Structure formats: C-alpha cells, structure tokens
Amino acid sequence: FEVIKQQKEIIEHGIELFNKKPKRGIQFLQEQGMLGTSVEDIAQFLHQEERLDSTQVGDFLGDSARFNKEVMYAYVDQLDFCEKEFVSALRTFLEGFRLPGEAQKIDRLMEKFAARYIECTLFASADTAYVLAYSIIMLTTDLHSPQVKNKMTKEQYIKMNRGINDSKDLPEEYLSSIYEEIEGKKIA
User: Where is this gene product found?
Assistant: First the structure.
C-alpha cells in the first residue's frame, strides 16, 4: 500500500556495490534516482548512510577526479570546526572515514582540511595546520602504536616540530596540552 517506501530502502544494493566499486554504488544510486547528480549530494551521501565501507569512503573522498576533489570539498564543508581546537576538527573530521596509505591523497584532504580550518592568533597561515595536522598524525601513530617500544616523549614531541608557523614556533603550550590529548586518546 504505502510501503512503496520500503523499495527505496533497497538503497542497500548501492552501498553493497559502493563498498567495492564506489564509482558504481553512486552511479547506480542515480540511475534509480536515489542520489543527487550534483556533488554536494555525494559528499553528503558519503556523510549520511554510514553503512558505507569506512575504508572505501576513505579512498573515494580523496582521489584525483575533478568530481572527487570537490565531492570531498563538499564533505570537508559539511564538517563544522566551529568553536573547537585544532585537535578536535581533525578528531571529528578523520572519523568520517579511515585515512588511506596513499601519500598524494593524504595531502589533498590535509590541504583542504587545513585550508578550510583557517576559514571558521596561534596560527600564522593555513600551511601550519596542514603541517601541524601531521605532527598529530605522526603523534598518535608513534605513541598509540604497539611495537615501537620506545614511545615518543613530551620534550621530544614539542621540541621536535620547532617552527611549524613561519620562522618562529608554536607556543610550547598548545603543544603540551595537545600532547596529553593524544597521549590520553587515540583518533585511531
């Protein structure tokens, strides 16, 4: 009768395919008229139906396709970093998917994560975030990583990245407190 609705629920096949062939699950979720032809709807879908492979969304939201560098931009501008410290944005950003081991890709997201961070003081430019967004990636990676017996220290974490914005360095404090956030919690 009005269970005409339970038929769109079939948008499960689109994520069944998306999880292996992402360039398909989306292609299909339009041939049926389920997803927005435009991109903002794809950075959105990739933001809505969370039964999507958290590692398929990753690779997708970061490829070299004109359609992608934006499908991701609409995804970066769907995540609000309003009124919260850097560590969080990253925390709450890098939780919508799982970061891919592709070097040319990380920098894409880390460029429009940083660049867009500085849109919404302790930062000189947006290339300090994209360069601090790493000290934090290499932070949790080293510490919250079983095997590297010797875990990174404090007067080592901070003293290391001496000069993340311009010639001068970031307050030896932002670095301290940020240290006990990751030393306490693991973004991954």
Answer: Cytoplasm; Membrane; Golgi apparatus; Cytoplasm, Perinuclear region
Last residue of a domain, one of 50, 81, 112: 81
Is 155 annotated as catalytic?
no
Alpha helix (H) ranges present in 77-136?
A: 86-93, 103-117, 132-135
Return the number of other C-beta atoms located less than 10 Å from residue 78's C-beta.
14
Residue reference for tokens 């660049």: 115
Resolution in Å, one decimal place: 3.0
Token readout for 106 is 């990380």
**Which of 102, 155, 172, 180 is the catalytic position?**
102
End-to-end Cα spacing for the chain: 46
Q: How far is the CA of 95 from the CAs of 14, 156, 184, in angstroms?
A: 22, 27, 17
Q: Look at residues 157, 153, 158 and name the one whose alpha carbon lies nearest to residue 170.
A: 158
Amino acid residing at 175:
L
Count the alpha carbons within 13 Å of 126 in the hemisphere toward its beta carbon: 13
Structural contact between residues 47 and 39, judged by C-beta atoms closer than 8 angstroms:
no
| CATH number of residue 76's parent domain | 1.10.220.20
Number of Cβ within 10 Å of residue 186's Cβ equals: 13
- Give the separation between CA 185 and CA 40, rounded to whole angstroms: 32
Rounded to an integer, what is the distance from CA 96 to the centroid of its chain? 6
Determination method here?
A: X-ray
